[PDB]
Subunit: 223 residues, 4 copies
């Protein structure tokens, strides 16, 4: 596009291959509490904040919301379990795509409702020189999280951008929904186990099978 | 069955009010230079007025509406809605309520509506059916559909567990709220959307109208 | 409707509760031949003639069509297995609905590509006085079968009817597709294990959960 | 990989001919008092001319077209199609073919088209790529897409099993034919339909264009 200034990347399943760990950790911590959240459902709910994920389960199974102390207790258990796995590595193609974006004079940004500190603290070491602190959105900015467009709208505000000056790179239907409802052109990369139809149904303007094929295709789609 | 209660949505289930709500949202947004189509208003059916306004601002302006903007637009919408000849009952709603009540079940209303003209007409339209203590309205909720909050609140007011209730809904966000509350949810497709959207939202059954639901009730509850 | 003259009923899963048997028999006969057709896939393919069902499997698994002698051999094995089960009983609500249709001066018809003779020979005993021989479509009329609209168009021709003078009652997505592509108002009854969305996606104008609820609702929908 | 061959559809994959086919079908049907929209012509992409004509007759007239009707309508459609400036290559098709050939794979064409002007331009557009003995056209088939017949015939002509080939298709009925042949099928969404329809038909991968497929080929074949 001719108007493009910024590329807004989600983190889990776009920059880091972290979803096998998040899905396993959510499934196991819920099971420890006698609550049912399958690994597949964890993928379906990918994009929600920790508080929202916990509340989905509490609301359907226990008929109430979690209290804040329950949210914090369960999230801390989930985070400990996530961190017990060998640390998540970069999605293949992410670094190469970021280099391309930057070389073209575009501003990369990260937009996530993650509170998984061990990942956030590794962004610079994994993608050196790509991201600016003042141009990032994390759990420490967000009140609602995806699928609310709030995090992407916050990224636009931080960047001094209009929606038509950005592209979102997302991999999960709730994350695509947030980008789309922010009015931003959204590219889905199907890096999980779900059908690509769910990404398109959520509003993705393009769909690719992987970050590496997006990288391979980037110059063509931006022409 | 351990069925004890039937939780009815109001707009498009008890009253034929959606042609009016969709028109009024479309028109008031148009007055403010914002594009909200009648079809889109149906897609948003279920949300509170404040949430509806915010979502349009988020997409079209890249920001949340201010509290002032929400109050002003909603005030205009309510005036316009009430300028139409008052909404009539959905055919079949009263017959179904008599059936439910005759079977010893407790009718409840669950809505994020704060439309006083409709809420204060419930008793006159469905005499003896509903009680303020057994209703959830805009005045009870923080989030509203599609959050299961209002249905969970109704369960609590009724002293119910989710497996003791059935929800009757007509809109995808409403079906989603009932389903995410863990409650068996029957969709009645009383609007212009494809029924697939109601099933996709988690409806356990789909009927084309309140009258066919009424006709079919004793069979499905066997 | 004010134009309605005829109601065109499918047989399997609408008049007879025969689909648990057809699906099991197809699955088992294919397994005997070292071919994969799941019970769920048998439901997905409900509506196809025997030759078509066999060819779906041969084409995807063996890279060719079945010969006619193979089709007849395998179909006869399937029919023997189907007939080894206690004979299929009426769908609850079918007889009551047919009585209603007839009392309203509508002409009931049967439209099926089934060659399962044991069911066809039982139609009169199960629904006495409802159907006319000259106003039926079976495997012995059809060249292609559902999802081709051919069988429903043949029913219209036999009945001296225009598409707008009939209603189809179907329960399977390929059968709904045939009715819809014949230009006929089609009511789906979800009497199997599939999602109702598949019936609606195929073109059904109404969807009910069972023959008994259709029966309960018939006078309302025809007003 | 035991990959040996790449089976290309023609219209909307090798040539940008679908704006012309859809317009010509729409117009010729209109001349005969039959409603076939341009969008519907895209939905039917893949079918042989005879099948396309029959389906419209079945829905609108309640009968099959006669052989005479099929021959007359098809004759008119072919004349109209060829009255447009001849269709150009899909960007990326030639580069992809060079890549495929360089990797030792056998290109094939699989189509129910009998459009001689396009079939007889294959060699001039893609020199050295294709051979008549390794093609399937309208002149080979009894049924055509979405029956897997044409893909199965291509496998046979190439001495292939289904696990030794990849199909490149752009239309839902074409994807369906490849998938029902048991062949890995890549959809390229080069028309106006939603990509969900291509995935619903059984595509294993979806790309937005022939050029992005070309760009991505070496990565997906790793
Ligand atoms: Ca993600
Ligand atoms: Ca949503
Ligand atoms: Ca999967
Ligand atoms: Ca789309
Ligand atoms: Ca409603
Ligand atoms: Ca509609
Ligand atoms: Ca369902
Ligand atoms: Ca059937
Ligand atoms: Ca079809
Ligand atoms: Ca099921
Ligand atoms: Ca429909
Ligand atoms: Ca094509
Ligand atoms: Ca389109
Ligand atoms: Ca798939
Ligand atoms: Mg949702
Ligand atoms: Mg098909």
């Amino acid at each position: 596009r001719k108007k493009l200034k910024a590329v807004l990347f989600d983190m889990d399943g776009v920059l880091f291959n972290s979803m096998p760990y998040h899905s396993e950790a959510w499934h196991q911590v819920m099971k420890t509490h006698g609550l049912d959240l399958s690994r597949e459902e964890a993928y379906m709910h990918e994009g929600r904040t920790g508080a929202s994920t916990i509340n989905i389960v509490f609301q359907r199974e226990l008929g109430k919301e979690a209290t804040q102390e329950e949210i914090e207790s369960i999230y801390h258990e989930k985070s400990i379990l996530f961190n017990s796995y060998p640390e998540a590595e970069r999605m293949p193609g992410a670094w190469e795509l970021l280099q391309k974006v930057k070389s073209e004079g575009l501003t990369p940004m990260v937009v996530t409702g993650s509170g998984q500190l061990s990942l956030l603290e590794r962004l610079e070491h994994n993608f050196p020189g790509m991201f600016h602190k003042e141009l990032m959105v994390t759990a420490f900015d967000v009140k609602y999280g995806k699928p609310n467009p709030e995090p992407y709208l916050m990224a636009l505000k931080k960047g001094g951008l209009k929606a038509d000056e950005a592209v979102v790179i997302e991999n999960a239907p709730l994350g695509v929904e947030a980008g789309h409802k922010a009015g931003i052109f959204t590219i889905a990369v199907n890096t999980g186990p779900l059908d690509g139809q769910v990404l398109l149904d959520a509003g993705a303007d393009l769909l690719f099978p992987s970050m590496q094929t997006l990288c391979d295709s980037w110059d063509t789609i931006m022409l």
